[PDB]
Symmetry: none
Subunit: 99 residues, 2 copies
């Protein structure tokens, strides 16, 4: 399902918690209450998961932009020593850009 | 100084760091004219905020705020024994920028942060 594919992707975003360089990070709260600190691309995707569950986007349209975010993130490798992308985050953007 | 002109001043200084010793590596960036520079990690993130400003993603004030935040952290790291002898040009850069009082400079004419020193 398009729906179940989305709930896959945000289960991956959860596990990118604390996978940050020396600088940077994005705080997002769950429905669980738990706060997580995640990379820029993964945060932009988490935001599209919110719009979806808030009836602002369809599953189809949410998943489209999610994949489009991942593809742009995959291309970006401008990172310095102080804000390195972790390998776990790199695999996530590759996986999601595949779909 | 306008915020715009302060940014242009900082980035002229970043360009002069081309080739100078970063002990934690280097970062290639390309100028608008096409020329490629190799600069340290703090200068490179400062350069990236300049780009975000030029693309209209940040205001001049918001760009300078993070530029100065990065130069403060980079200056603190540069005072360590590992780094504080062998990268002087990089040290002077991060020291100048970290000493900018932004909100006072936007009042006025470059204004510096007034503070106590043990001396
Ligand atoms: O905002 P920054 O200071 O650049 O911080 C980096 C970004 O959040 C990166 O997001 P990305 O993977 O989507 O590029 C992340 O992977 C890094 O670990 C952070 O250090």
């Amino acid at each position: 399902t398009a729906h179940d594919l989305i709930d896959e992707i945000i289960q991956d975003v959860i596990q990118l918690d604390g996978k940050l360089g020396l600088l940077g990070g994005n705080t997002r709260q769950l429905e669980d209450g738990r706060v997580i600190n995640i990379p820029n691309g993964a945060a932009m995707i988490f935001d599209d998961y919110k719009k979806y569950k808030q009836g602002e986007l369809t599953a189809e349209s949410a998943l489209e932009s999610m994949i489009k975010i991942a593809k742009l993130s995959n291309q970006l490798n401008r990172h310095t020593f102080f804000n390195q992308r972790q390998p776990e985050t790199g695999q996530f953007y590759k996986k999601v850009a595949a779909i």
